[PDB]
Design an enzyme around this catalytic site. Structure first.
Site, PDB file in Angstrom:
ATOM      1  N   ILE A  20     -69.655 -15.085   0.965  1.00 46.69           N
ATOM      2  CA  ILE A  20     -69.812 -16.069   1.964  1.00 46.69           C
ATOM      3  C   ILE A  20     -71.401 -16.527   2.140  1.00 46.69           C
ATOM      4  O   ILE A  20     -71.572 -17.307   2.626  1.00 46.69           O
ATOM      5  CB  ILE A  20     -68.883 -15.616   3.099  1.00 46.69           C
ATOM      6  CG1 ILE A  20     -68.593 -17.008   3.941  1.00 46.69           C
ATOM      7  CG2 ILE A  20     -69.267 -14.768   3.687  1.00 46.69           C
ATOM      8  CD1 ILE A  20     -67.811 -18.103   3.113  1.00 46.69           C
TER       9      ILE A  20
ATOM     10  N   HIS B 122     -81.909 -15.776   3.220  1.00 49.18           N
ATOM     11  CA  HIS B 122     -80.501 -15.922   2.793  1.00 49.18           C
ATOM     12  C   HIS B 122     -80.312 -16.922   1.449  1.00 49.18           C
ATOM     13  O   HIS B 122     -79.400 -16.290   0.817  1.00 49.18           O
ATOM     14  CB  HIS B 122     -79.841 -16.554   4.275  1.00 49.18           C
ATOM     15  CG  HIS B 122     -78.237 -16.547   4.081  1.00 49.18           C
ATOM     16  ND1 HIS B 122     -77.443 -17.608   4.652  1.00 49.18           N
ATOM     17  CD2 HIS B 122     -77.512 -15.552   3.430  1.00 49.18           C
ATOM     18  CE1 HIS B 122     -76.283 -17.351   4.138  1.00 49.18           C
ATOM     19  NE2 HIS B 122     -76.042 -16.217   3.650  1.00 49.18           N
TER      20      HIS B 122
ATOM     21  N   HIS C 287     -78.291 -15.827  -2.675  1.00 53.36           N
ATOM     22  CA  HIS C 287     -77.224 -17.034  -3.081  1.00 53.36           C
ATOM     23  C   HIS C 287     -77.768 -17.668  -4.517  1.00 53.36           C
ATOM     24  O   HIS C 287     -77.027 -17.546  -5.449  1.00 53.36           O
ATOM     25  CB  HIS C 287     -77.006 -18.004  -2.081  1.00 53.36           C
ATOM     26  CG  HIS C 287     -75.963 -17.383  -0.987  1.00 53.36           C
ATOM     27  ND1 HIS C 287     -74.774 -18.243  -0.974  1.00 53.36           N
ATOM     28  CD2 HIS C 287     -76.113 -16.817  -0.032  1.00 53.36           C
ATOM     29  CE1 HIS C 287     -74.330 -17.687   0.164  1.00 53.36           C
ATOM     30  NE2 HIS C 287     -74.928 -16.781   0.608  1.00 53.36           N
TER      31      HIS C 287
ATOM     32  N   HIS D 110     -77.505  -8.862   0.999  1.00 55.04           N
ATOM     33  CA  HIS D 110     -76.562  -9.932   1.445  1.00 55.04           C
ATOM     34  C   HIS D 110     -76.054  -9.674   2.720  1.00 55.04           C
ATOM     35  O   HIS D 110     -75.960 -10.506   3.770  1.00 55.04           O
ATOM     36  CB  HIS D 110     -75.747 -10.546   0.475  1.00 55.04           C
ATOM     37  CG  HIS D 110     -75.047 -11.545   0.985  1.00 55.04           C
ATOM     38  ND1 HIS D 110     -73.816 -11.689   1.277  1.00 55.04           N
ATOM     39  CD2 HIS D 110     -75.363 -13.087   1.100  1.00 55.04           C
ATOM     40  CE1 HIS D 110     -73.275 -12.804   1.636  1.00 55.04           C
ATOM     41  NE2 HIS D 110     -74.402 -13.610   1.637  1.00 55.04           N
TER      42      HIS D 110
ATOM     43  N   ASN E 254     -76.576 -11.741   6.094  1.00 58.77           N
ATOM     44  CA  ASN E 254     -75.703 -12.493   6.600  1.00 58.77           C
ATOM     45  C   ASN E 254     -74.758 -12.349   7.791  1.00 58.77           C
ATOM     46  O   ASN E 254     -74.929 -13.385   8.587  1.00 58.77           O
ATOM     47  CB  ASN E 254     -74.533 -12.782   5.474  1.00 58.77           C
ATOM     48  CG  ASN E 254     -73.479 -13.607   5.604  1.00 58.77           C
ATOM     49  OD1 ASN E 254     -73.971 -15.021   5.477  1.00 58.77           O
ATOM     50  ND2 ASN E 254     -72.343 -13.580   5.640  1.00 58.77           N
TER      51      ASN E 254
END
Ligand SMILES: [Fe+3]
Length: 807
Positions: free
Chosen positions: A807, A467, A472, A658, A662
């Site tokens: 997010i 993650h 990110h 993602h 997530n």
């Protein structure tokens, strides 16, 4: 005259008569008629005339005098003389209609070195730009780069790179000093956006703390409903809610330790009784109040996690433990075992023998012999041994942290589900113990604890590597390179920018509150200060081209290349939910990128000839992922095929990859015993009180081994934020403005792509309703794998693929 209408959003809507008069002027620029120096002709200052759509927006009419001598407008300048900013959305001109999709904050003129320019929605590779517009295109790009020095202010639109030297806090305490990640071979790391706050007093190499971690102004997403500002919730939870909780535990207002599983289940049932002062701190906070149900003065209760919604015990089944390796929060680490025992790659000279002590004869492979199972490719493993073993001695010296490096061997049963046959727990010569499955007696509790160690290992790897790093951290270099090098007019900018939304903003909030020294991840996860350091160690082995889903599956030995299949890959775990659904989404994105790129690039030489494209990729690799720049696997953009690939992998990571890792976080992790973030105790020796407690009270034994109660409350609140879709989320197959390009051929191809996603969701619903797929797609918890369904509504939905890392 040409009639124009300007759509605005005043600051307050996202954080009317005043906009009229001489407050805002636009000046139109010609795309087809140049002045005596080659630039497009500029028109007179025209101001907003009168008030004249979506929520918060306000339309204003403007009339520009324009003669045939001036040609066709392709851009415009705007000067805001008001003291306060506004968000300019668009301008539509009833000429030729011409649409300028702006979506940009414009502050008072005196705050800008250059006057703001916006262009119409026409797409042009550099060589196809209208010559009057060429100068403007180049200057604007230059403006977004800045000169590398200076402290970034709120209104700046400057994109640049810096190393992660801003996580430590050396001036508050030396115990909060942290390695500078990136810029070295010891600690390679992707770059992040430069903020420029300056050095600390103690260390010239650490950036000093700040109130707001700058992102360029239009990366800092405003929100029409405060509720949707989930990103600031991570800051609120670190800075306000975590203090409040910590005081309550210092005050012994509630038990500091869970004693039975029911104590954990209480969190979502009757709630937890906290001091009034704590409840009054929480429920004014706009994003934080949405995280819990409260009675206003004493009870706080959490949403019931999806994993317990049918059976509140099913997470304890070996079936579920294994099932989640292919359909859980972290469905992408399992590998195919091709030789037995598993081998280690740690250096003999530093670590000695590190070989699996698991013996094949102890393995119940349902009647198969090792040779049979291996030959039929039915043995898989979840191996965290080399990843954690260099860090285990250091972690175990931290107070209240004790772990093992684990190996789990899995057998694929004749019915296609996975069976955990052995867990190997090793400590620094690797001291090892093999734990086999057991249904009753002390032995079943030792197996239960062994699965908890495996999932602490997995949780830490999920959060930090799957993650934080792979989506990110890996994506931010490409966001910065795109703005610095690819003009707003550039096709590939229009293709890529949708998949960047809110990425830089959440990352700056993350550096400030999540992965910072003494932040949320160090507080709630096992490695504590070693946490981001470990992801650097893993980045040493990051390969951009391996991030393609087929490549990933093949590399992990969970699929073989197979031309006779719809995706050129044959899954060895046939119904591997993440992979199977993932391949459907992958192929859809591939067709979209393959339709789009030929519309602007006719031959390979066109790709080679795009100066902006060549400078974009050059910088993303050399500066963006600079510590890995000389690695042989970097694609070079010399062909159409290279461009399709690069675009595809970037879109896959941002959206589906993602999404998959997530949004299942609180669904599966909300029950801390299913997804523990830390181990605190090694396995008890016989003849001690803690061994007898395993026998007589296995639940207290388990709760003792895993994440304590106060870390759990903080952990749950963050992953609940992280698992929430905001109502302003733009999903895969959607765009925020329908007029993102004037090219109707690209718009048609996008409509096809959206329709293909609707077909795929239908296919996936059918898969979820298929009685033979139930085993892996629902499992003992009866939770249908909906994580890769493209659409979703707002909230904790366990579905919906956003365009970006939002997010
Ligand atoms: Fe995320």
């Amino acid at each position: 005259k040409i009639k124009g209408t300007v759509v605005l959003m005043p600051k307050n809507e996202l954080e009317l008569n005043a906009f009229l008069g001489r407050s805002v002027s636009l000046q139109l620029i010609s795309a087809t008629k140049a002045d005596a120096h080659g630039k497009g002709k500029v028109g007179k200052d025209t101001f907003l005339e009168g008030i004249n759509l979506g929520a918060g927006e306000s339309a204003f009419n403007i009339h520009f005098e324009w003669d045939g001598s001036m040609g066709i407008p392709g851009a415009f300048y705007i000067k805001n003389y008001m003291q306060v900013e506004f968000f300019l959305k668009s301008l539509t001109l009833e000429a030729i209609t011409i649409r300028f999709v702006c979506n940009s904050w414009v502050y008072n003129t005196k705050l800008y070195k250059s006057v703001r320019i916006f262009f119409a929605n026409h797409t042009y590779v550099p060589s196809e730009t209208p010559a009057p517009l060429v100068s403007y295109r180049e200057e604007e790009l230059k403006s977004l780069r800045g000169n590398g020095t200076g402290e970034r202010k709120e209104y700046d639109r400057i994109y640049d790179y810096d190393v992660y030297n801003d996580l430590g806090n050396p001036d508050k305490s030396e115990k909060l000093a942290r390695p500078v990640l990136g810029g070295s071979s010891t600690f390679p790391y992707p770059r992040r956006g430069r903020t420029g706050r300056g050095p600390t007093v103690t260390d010239p190499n650490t950036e000093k703390q700040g109130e707001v971690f700058y992102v360029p102004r239009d990366e800092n997403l405003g929100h029409l409903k405060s509720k949707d500002a989930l990103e600031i919730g991570t800051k609120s939870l670190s800075q306000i809610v975590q203090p409040a909780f910590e005081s309550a535990f210092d005050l012994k207002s509630t038990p500091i330790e869970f004693h039975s599983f029911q104590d954990v289940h209480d969190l979502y049932e009757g709630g937890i009784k906290l001091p009034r002062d704590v409840i009054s701190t929480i429920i004014p906070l706009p994003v934080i109040k949405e995280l819990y149900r409260t009675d206003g003065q004493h009870i706080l209760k959490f949403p019931q996690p999806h994993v317990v919604q049918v059976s509140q015990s099913a997470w304890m089944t070996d079936e579920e433990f294994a099932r989640e390796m292919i359909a859980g929060v972290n469905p992408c680490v399992i590998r195919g075992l091709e030789e037995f025992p598993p081998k280690s790659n740690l250096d003999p000279a530093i670590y000695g023998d590190q070989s699996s002590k698991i013996t094949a004869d102890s393995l119940d492979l349902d009647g198969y012999t090792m040779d049979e199972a291996l030959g039929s490719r039915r043995l898989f493993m979840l191996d965290y041994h080399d990843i954690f073993m260099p860090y285990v001695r250091q972690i175990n010296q931290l107070n209240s942290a004790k772990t093992y490096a684990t190996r789990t061997i899995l057998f694929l049963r004749e019915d296609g589900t996975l069976k955990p046959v052995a867990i190997e727990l090793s400590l620094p010569a690797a001291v090892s113990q093999v734990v086999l499955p057991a249904k009753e007696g002390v032995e079943s509790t030792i197996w239960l604890l062994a699965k908890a160690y495996v999932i602490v290992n997995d949780s830490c790897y999920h959060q930090l590597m799957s993650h934080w790093l792979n989506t990110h951290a890996a994506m931010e270099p490409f966001v910065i390179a795109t703005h610095r090098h690819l003009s707003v007019l550039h096709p590939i900018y229009k293709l890529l920018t949708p998949h960047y939304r809110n990425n830089m903003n959440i990352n700056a909030l993350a550096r400030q509150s999540l992965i910072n020294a003494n932040g949320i991840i160090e507080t709630t996860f096992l490695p504590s200060k070693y946490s981001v350091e470990m992801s650097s160690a893993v980045y040493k082995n990051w390969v951009f081209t391996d991030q393609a889903l087929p490549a990933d599956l093949i590399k992990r030995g969970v699929a073989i290349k197979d031309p006779s299949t719809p995706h050129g890959v044959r899954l060895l775990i046939e119904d591997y939910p993440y992979a199977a659904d993932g391949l459907e989404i992958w192929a859809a994105i591939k067709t979209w990128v393959q339709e789009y790129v030929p519309l602007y690039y006719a031959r390979d030489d066109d790709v080679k000839n795009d100066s902006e494209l060549q400078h974009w990729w050059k910088e993303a690799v050399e500066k963006g992922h600079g510590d890995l720049k000389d690695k042989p696997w970097w694609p070079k953009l010399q062909t159409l095929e290279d461009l399709v690939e690069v675009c595809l992998i970037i879109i896959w990571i941002a959206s589906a990859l993602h999404a998959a890792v997530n949004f299942g976080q609180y669904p599966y992790g909300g029950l801390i015993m299913n997804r523990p973030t830390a181990s605190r105790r090694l396995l008890p020796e016989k003849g001690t009180p803690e061994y007898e407690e395993m026998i007589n009270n296995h639940e207290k034994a388990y709760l003792r081994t895993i994440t304590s109660k106060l870390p759990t409350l903080i952990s749950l609140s963050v992953i609940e934020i992280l698992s929430t879709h905001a109502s302003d989320e733009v999903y895969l197959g959607q765009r925020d403005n329908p007029h993102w390009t004037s090219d109707s051929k690209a718009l048609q191809a996008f409509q096809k792509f959206g329709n293909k996603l609707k077909e795929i969701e239908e296919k996936l619903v059918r898969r979820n309703n298929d009685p033979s797929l139930q085993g892996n797609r629902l499992g003992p918890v009866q939770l249908p794998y909906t994580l890769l369904y493209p659409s979703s509504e707002e909230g904790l939905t366990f579905r919906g693929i956003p365009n970006s890392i939002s997010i």
